[PDB]
Symmetry: D2
Subunit: 283 residues, 4 copies
């Protein structure tokens, strides 16, 4: 269960190869965060012992996220999804990760053009029940990230994520919210946190255009006040798509730069988020 | 403990005489609220039995509020303050009221020009302990309303109000917040609710200029999200100074109309507030 | 140039057929709006005389909007695009419409998977000049609506829209903003309006989740203040997808109801927006 | 008229005596601001030659503000008001200041207990006309600052400020707004800027609780969007009562620290404000 402030490492590498891991860890120490979120584009390619040693040497904690590739979208190909998640779960555990979170129930770009069906949710629930048991056997948790309607048609709101978690009824699955998605989906941004309050262990603090937090349209005071009010003691992870490699940015509809450079995003956005966290007593 | 929506009868009556009481109860039923807040400007003159019958006949609940007159400000004249609050407490209880709230620790217009001192707080503590015991004997609670720096120099934030309630140590004093005062005093409006969460039983939903809720500078979404997040189950009371008699309006620095008339304030503000209450699941 | 308050007819109908036209117009009368916005998604299916007659009979102005079907995306099939727009232009004029607006430059759901090319914008420019010439021949104007990154990759912000319009050189193309889209795309929502200032004649007052204005995450005070500040005088139109036009469903990604029903949205959203327009003095 | 960013010197000193002036000007230099606002509350006590040399040495511009002492309130004692303003104006000019601004029309803490009257405003107009003449003779301008109802009963909104400027008919009096006061007085904070637009040349970017800008309740996005929309090119000045000049302490009502210290307000507030100025393109 994460604690404090962290950063999504896409700001310094989307590929967790050896130089990428080193560059992300160095950045994390520079900005003095408590944890990093490691994206696993290609789980088999990850050097678990290098990463584990980096994290322990520099007293850094970690979790991992992914989205399922189309060959393994849980809604329609659940056995492939179980297989893909078991690999990702095992890499996460081996490198010292405490959790695998993100769109672990489908992939960026699912859309049937109609509302989500019961059969789609049944497959997801089966995929998630299997994956959670494999996660508990390796001592880690699983996260369900609500994402906006355009990225996935199945889980877009805090309350939909909670409804999936109750179906499965596994102890070790938590909700993962993202203010960039909440800014589109939640009927008042605080409502996402409210609906998910019993299961919220992680939140992406991302600006409305994936740019510099504080300089967009997210209602930060509402967000931080509501987190304080529910007693949120999970992970506060900054996410910006700045200096994300172009072929992974184009995939999530980044057609133009989200901010000038890392030095605007991290120099303005991290102090802003940490000050707000202090202001509302989360620290 | 109060529950649901209510209205400060300021809008129809600042003198709770017999026809004022009738008019205010009539308005309450027209807007179909759950309770009214009766300002007790002159407690001795209140006809308790008349009001009690009005409330019971019409299945309305009620509480009362005041501020201490200068001859009885608790910080400097605790014995007079005690005498004044006993009369108010007894009139509140006799008319069927469930609490006496407001600036019961001081007066509107108190200012020494320097920070509140420990001797002032000792006097207030002694007054409040005596007042709360007298209220327990009559079966009612007392509320300590945080008001802004210009109205009183002693209790301006939820955290100061909580500190006083812990000093006194009495079970039947709760915190009373006001969004108009909070908009000035709280370092992030939701922090006043957070700080007072253990003790908060009543809140005035008043716009930043005492006009029409929804049409000023208050952070309504943060306020309602935070109230829902702490699980607030007490009273939601609209306060606007529209149609307040002139001499009372001047006492509170109303130098110009806050709003066009009651049509705007209750016709626009009450639906806005009840819609927000519904939006964030307080209903 | 449209003036006052209007509604996009998805409030009341999926399709602009004869029974849909009859019901939408009757509903617009009931709420005393000044204009309706008619989706022009199947031009050869619209009974223009039946619509024109209803407009005159009921003292109702109108304009039309569309997105281009993939067979005529200007980005890539410019010649098809020009010819589709000439037809839509002609039918807009025939029924009494005063402009054709929206995503007239491409698809709702158009995505190459990479950033837009100057060749794509070269084709759009050609399409738009040709179209604006034909619109001039029928006495109507064209509007270019900026939409978010997931619905189109070419024109996402007021500033992009303005650059396109300045390239084309037509006197009769205006910018059309939508608060739902700016909520995602603009770095501070008022920046969309500021950048579009010289050309902004139409805006969709659409909530962040396409639901009821005032009950999402859009920054309405900033929006209305900035519109007042720039002297906005064009049209103010609600857009809530209670009913979803079939040809654009896939791209609009409404997978679940945006609000309880049509009466919630007009009953709560329209007073809220009229009240904000009066609050900020909008012409 | 001023340009760029400045600070009210109460950030760094209580009194504009000689060691205060040295401390304030040295602090200003570390933050690289363009100007400082010097209180002019005991005009005979200001060493103008020492201040001027400090300002020119360190390439800092300056203006002054004050509130009138009760012996010289223009409402009631216009002849004394004129004589006090003539001396304040001369000292402002002698030290290199470019305007005298603030509550030049009355007192910080002035209240009759009743609403303002024509006789009061007629006296203010007579005083300001004489003052503006004397200001023109020394080559500086005068500002009228709207302050909230508790600090003064005469000029509380931008529209009231403008009305006084037009009642006086001078050509060298501007309007001075303050977000801390607008947060209470304006019916939507942008409305204060809108109403004052033709005359607005100076604004106090002060947080709702006089603390750190960005960490209170002011609607900064609406403020900066609206300032950009009207083409604001005047001074942008912080005002945080880290130190309280004793002559106005009673009226300003700072009873508890507004923030931890000058390092917090300037280290977090100034970058927030600069970044917002950049975001909305005032630069
Ligand atoms: O906001 C919109 C959806 O992106 C646009 O208004 C559409 O262009 C419109 O519905 C077409 O009728
Ligand atoms: O905001 C203010 C009053 O509350 C003004 O800035 C004062 O005029 C200033 O503090 C006087 O130096
Ligand atoms: Mg995320
Ligand atoms: Mg109150
Ligand atoms: Mg639209
Ligand atoms: Mg000021």
């Amino acid at each position: 269960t994460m604690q404090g402030f962290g950063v999504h490492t896409s700001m310094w590498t989307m590929n967790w190869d050896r130089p990428g891991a080193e560059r992300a860890v160095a950045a994390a120490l520079k900005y003095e965060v408590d944890f990093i979120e490691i994206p696993m584009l290609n789980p088999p390619a990850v050097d678990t012992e290098h990463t584990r040693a980096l994290l322990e040497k520099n007293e850094l904690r970690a979790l991992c996220s992914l989205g399922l590739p189309e060959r393994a979208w849980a809604s329609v190909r659940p056995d492939a999804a179980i297989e893909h998640l078991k690999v990702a779960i095992d890499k996460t555990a081996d490198l010292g990760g405490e959790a695998l979170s993100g769109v672990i129930y489908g992939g960026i770009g699912e859309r049937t053009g109609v509302p989500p069906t019961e059969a789609e949710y049944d497959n997801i629930a089966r995929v998630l029940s299997a994956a959670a048991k494999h996660a508990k056997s390796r001592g880690i948790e699983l996260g369900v990230e609500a994402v906006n309607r355009y990225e996935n048609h199945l889980i877009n709101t805090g309350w939909q994520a909670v409804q999936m978690i109750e179906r499965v009824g596994a102890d070790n699955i938590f909700v993962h919210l993202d203010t960039y998605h909440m800014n589109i989906e939640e009927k008042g941004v605080g409502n996402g946190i409210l609906d998910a309050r019993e299961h919220l262990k992680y939140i992406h603090l991302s600006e409305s255009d994936r740019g510099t937090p504080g300089y967009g349209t997210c209602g930060w005071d509402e967000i931080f006040s509501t987190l304080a009010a529910i007693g949120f003691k999970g992970g506060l992870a900054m996410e910006s798509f700045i200096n994300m490699p172009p072929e992974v940015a184009y995939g999530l509809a980044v057609w133009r730069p989200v901010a000038k450079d890392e030095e605007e995003v991290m120099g303005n956005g991290l102090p802003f988020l940490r000050n707000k966290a202090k202001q509302y007593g989360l620290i």
